From a paper:
Rotation is driven by a flagellar motor, which is a supercomplex containing multiple rings. The C-ring (C = cytoplasmic), which contains multiple copies of protein subunits called FliG, FliM and FliN, switches the rotation of the flagellum between counterclockwise (CCW) and clockwise (CW). The switch is also the site of torque generation for the flagellum, through an electrostatic interaction with a stator called MotA/B4. The switch also connects to the MS-ring (MS = membrane–supramembrane), which transmits both the direction and the speed of rotation to the flagellar rod.
In one of our CW switchΔPAA datasets, we observed density for a binding partner within the cleft in the FliG subunit. The bound protein moved both FliFC/FliGD1/D2 of the inner ring and FliGD5 of the outer ring, as a unit, by ~10 Å toward the centre of the ring. One of our CW data sets showed density within an ~40 Å cleft between FliG domains, identifying one binding site for regulatory proteins. The size of the density is consistent with a globular domain of ~120 amino acids. Because it bridges FliFC/FliGD1 and FliGD5, which differ between CCW and CW, this protein should be specific for the CW pose. The local resolution for this density was 9 Å, making it difficult to identify the species from the maps. YcgR and CheY could be docked, while quinol:fumarate reductase and FliO fit the density poorly. Thus, we cannot identify the bound species.
Author numbering:
A (entry chain N): 45 to 137
B (entry chain M): 44 to 330
C (entry chain F): 514 to 560
D (entry chain G): 3 to 168, 172 to 324
E (entry chain P): 55 to 137
F (entry chain Q): 57 to 137
């Protein structure tokens, strides 16, 4: 049942491992540029210094967060949960 | 459970020009212009082909080196009767039908010449695109004795042809196992290629010159930690998730990695310091 | 049987003549080989 | 005896392999092997004989050969040289096949029409049509009669359709037919010989095998019994024939065989007697009782032997 | 449950077999290997390498379609992983 | 050089949607995947891919008709998809 399937996942799929991904920034760069690039080259990204990094799972937008050096151990601290309207606005760009 | 579905382009025109060459050959051989109508290429299991095969008939084994296995060509008793009486010059408007009776020596010999003529026609037609030598092996009267395929359910591709000489008509088929064309599965699907002379090569290089200024976006990843949707649901904004030390940054476009890099603080920007471009050729050379 | 011995001597002379006839047959086989083949065909036809 | 074939054979066994090879290549396999056997085992050698053989060869050389250049032996090679010098078309080879084809057509006319038919029934009906057209009209009519009705009608219809009169394909068609009789003649079918062999056997074993083959195949057994049949009914045997045989056959032998034979056989045999002979035979049949069945069968076998002798003479059709 | 709308990755398998690397050393590029699950057994249905359920593939609508038949059944999951 | 038994893995295609559309369908619901009829399958070892090959049935048991070791080229495309 549709309701049964929705109800099942809250308990049956409650215990299930998943994956995630995080992105730093985006820059326009073409094959001429990559061929010209060499060892030790530095490339910047549109992500401003200190900007929280977007957090996604299997390529699906989830949230945004920033890494913090706690106990000399890096850890991303999320700051928001993307709303459907803000997600629509983000993809409408 | 054996199901295969595919479409081909080159073999259609190959069969068409082969049929035109065969029509020319029969015209000059029998002093009378024939007409060959190529039927829609048949793809069926070997047992289905054997069932559809009109018994009695003559089956012929023609090996195709260097590809493993032997090819098959079949002809109808009506076709061989009509061809041989045209060789005799008889009208054949009062024909006889032979069933179960094995072909006489003269009939099998006329079969031999027409078989070698068909072999030569198909050889020139095929070598016009891809040079694959064809060598006859052994004629057969019953399909079960041909036993080319491993199993009767093995899918065999067949090209039917409808050949007529004036009022007299006929049909013969050229059938081949799918395993025979398995090595050239890509070459059969695509239509043949025009040109391919030195200019075409440089034109392809010129295409790369135009493609030099392409449009692509790179993706940078830091951590891919396996967690649970239970944790995600109980996760709230402000929560921090520890991350192992990212000794390098992997760069990929549409999924495929291209290089590795190190993050750096340059001019107040999320800058990455590349180490080396990750090339498949470089990885193969290293391995 | 002195006459029989003379007949045997005549037979030996006939044998020498037969060897000469065989040599003549060999000569016919030897010279004009074409003509020998033609005579072969002619004898086959007469057969 | 020394026939023209035998004279050439003696010539060959006298001369040697130098001309024997050419004779073989211009000759046929059975005569090649006959001369090989003659070389293997020879007892026809004499001082005068060999010289006479050389003289006969000289006669053949001056007459049959007429001291001419190799006849189609080395000439065919120069003919091929001219053919090669002229257009690239082996017409001479086609003419060679035509030569065998025409000879085979003549042979076809000579040989048995029904055997020709069954050798050509399997072949193409157009082959039958064209070969029948090219054959003699009488031989063609014989093969036409020996054909079944439907095949015969198809052959004549395709004869009517036959207008291509083709050109070297026809020659090799006859060559294939000749090769299908080129194989050892055999002809050991002996459709009559089974019957003949059973007749040669004892009469009781003959009847036993007749019953056995009746069980095997009533058709084949009935054919064998027909082959046994020899002057059993007047109408098929012909009275004129009963008249002619039985005056040649001894009257006493006929009497002894008849008193052991069936009364219908006695009546049909006596109907061709001179009336005095018939009356004498019947009176003696009444007088003497049935003599030993061995002697009765001996007289019957003598009657059959005289029937076979007159069949050898061939003046009339026995039964 | 705002995270309800999340694309999941599923994994469908046929069967397993404990083969040593030497076996694969001799197994050619066109070799045949059997499994442990008998033919006709419902193929195990998993997601991201995690056991879920089982199902059988059937040729319907000109495509290979697996038919979900069993539920996650955590007790049966415990029993299965106890192997 | 040293030998050891190892776990293999065969995968019949991968789709792209939430499991909810799948779990809403109760038991006995037939669902298809990107795995169609005709394409050869893939073999993984401990989750690490090796080769491609169709699988047939023999002696009431599955038999894989493996073809050739998967190269990193098409490994990249199958990782992307």
């Amino acid at each position: 049942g549709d309701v049964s399937g929705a109800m099942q996942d809250i308990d049956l799929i409650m215990d299930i491992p998943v994956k995630l991904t995080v992105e730093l920034g985006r820059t326009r760069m073409t094959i001429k540029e990559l061929l010209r690039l060499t060892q030790g080259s530095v490339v910047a990204l549109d992500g401003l210094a200190g900007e929280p990094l977007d957090i996604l799972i299997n390529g699906y937008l989830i949230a945004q967060g920033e890494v913090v050096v706690v106990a000399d151990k890096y850890g991303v601290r999320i700051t928001d949960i993307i709303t459907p309207s803000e997600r629509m606005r983000r993809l409408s760009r | 459970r054996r199901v295969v579905r595919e479409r081909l382009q080159a073999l259609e025109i190959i069969n068409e020009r082969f049929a035109r060459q065969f029509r020319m050959g029969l015209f000059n051989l029998l002093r009378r212009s024939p007409d060959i109508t190529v039927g829609a290429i048949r793809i069926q299991p070997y047992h289905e082909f054997a069932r559809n095969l009109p018994v009695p008939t003559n089956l012929n084994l023609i090996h195709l080196k260097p590809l493993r296995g032997t090819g098959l060509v079949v002809f109808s008793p009506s076709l061989v009767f009509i061809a041989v009486d045209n060789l005799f010059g008889g009208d054949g408007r009062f024909p006889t039908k032979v069933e179960g009776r094995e072909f006489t020596h003269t009939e099998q010999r006329v079969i031999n010449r027409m078989l070698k003529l068909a072999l030569e026609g198909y050889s020139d037609a095929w070598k016009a695109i891809n040079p694959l030598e064809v060598e006859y092996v052994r004629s057969e009267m019953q399909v079960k004795f041909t036993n080319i395929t491993t199993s009767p359910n093995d899918i065999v591709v067949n090209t039917p042809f409808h050949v007529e000489i004036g009022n007299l008509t006929g049909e013969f088929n050229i059938c081949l196992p799918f395993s025979m064309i398995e090595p050239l599965r890509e070459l059969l699907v695509n239509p043949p290629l025009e040109n391919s002379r030195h200019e075409d090569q440089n034109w392809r290089d010129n295409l790369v010159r135009q493609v030099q200024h392409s449009e692509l976006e790179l993706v940078a990843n830091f951590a891919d930690i396996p967690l649970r949707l239970s944790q995600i649901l109980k996760l709230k904004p402000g929560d921090v998730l520890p991350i192992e030390k990212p000794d390098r940054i992997i760069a990929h476009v549409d999924g495929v990695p291209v290089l590795t890099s190190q993050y750096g603080t340059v001019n107040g920007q999320y800058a990455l310091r590349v180490e080396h471009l990750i090339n498949p050729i470089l990885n193969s050379l290293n391995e | 049987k002195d006459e029989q011995l003379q007949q045997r001597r005549a037979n030996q002379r006939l044998g020498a003549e037969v060897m000469s006839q065989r040599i003549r047959e060999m000569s016919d086989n030897d010279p004009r080989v074409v003509a020998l083949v033609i005579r072969q065909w002619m004898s086959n036809d007469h057969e | 005896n020394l026939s023209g074939t035998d004279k050439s054979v003696i010539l060959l066994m006298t001369i040697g392999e130098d001309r024997a090879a050419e004779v073989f290549k211009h000759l046929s396999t059975r005569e090649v092997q006959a001369l090989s056997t003659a070389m293997a085992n020879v007892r026809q050698i004499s001082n005068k004989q060999l010289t006479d053989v050389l003289s006969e060869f000289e006669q053949e050389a001056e007459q049959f050969a007429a001291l001419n250049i190799n006849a189609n032996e080395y000439l065919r090679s120069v003919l091929v040289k001219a053919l090669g010098e002229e257009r690239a078309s082996s017409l001479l080879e086609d003419i060679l096949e035509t030569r065998d084809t025409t000879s085979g057509i003549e042979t076809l006319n000579f040989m048995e029409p029904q055997s020709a038919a069954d050798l050509i029934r399997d072949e193409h009906p157009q082959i039958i049509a064209t070969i029948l057209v090219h054959l003699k009209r009488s031989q063609a009519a014989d093969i036409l009669a020996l054909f079944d009705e439907r095949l015969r009608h198809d052959v004549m219809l395709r004869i009517a359709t036959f207008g291509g009169v083709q050109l070297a394909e026809l020659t090799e068609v006859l060559n294939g037919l000749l090769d299908g009789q080129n194989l050892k003649r055999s002809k050991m079918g002996g459709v009559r010989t089974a019957a003949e062999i059973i007749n040669l056997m004892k009469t009781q074993q003959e009847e036993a095998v007749i019953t056995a083959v009746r069980e095997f195949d009533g058709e084949l057994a009935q054919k064998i019994i027909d082959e046994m049949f020899l002057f059993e009914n007047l109408v098929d045997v012909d009275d004129r024939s009963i008249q002619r045989l039985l005056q040649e056959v001894d009257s006493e032998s006929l009497l002894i065989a008849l008193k052991g034979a069936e009364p219908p056989l006695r009546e049909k045999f006596l109907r061709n007697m001179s009336q005095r002979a018939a009356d004498i035979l019947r009176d003696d049949l009444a007088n003497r009782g049935p003599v030993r069945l061995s002697q009765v069968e001996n007289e019957q076998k003598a009657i059959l032997l005289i029937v076979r002798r007159l069949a050898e003479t061939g003046e009339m059709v026995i039964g």
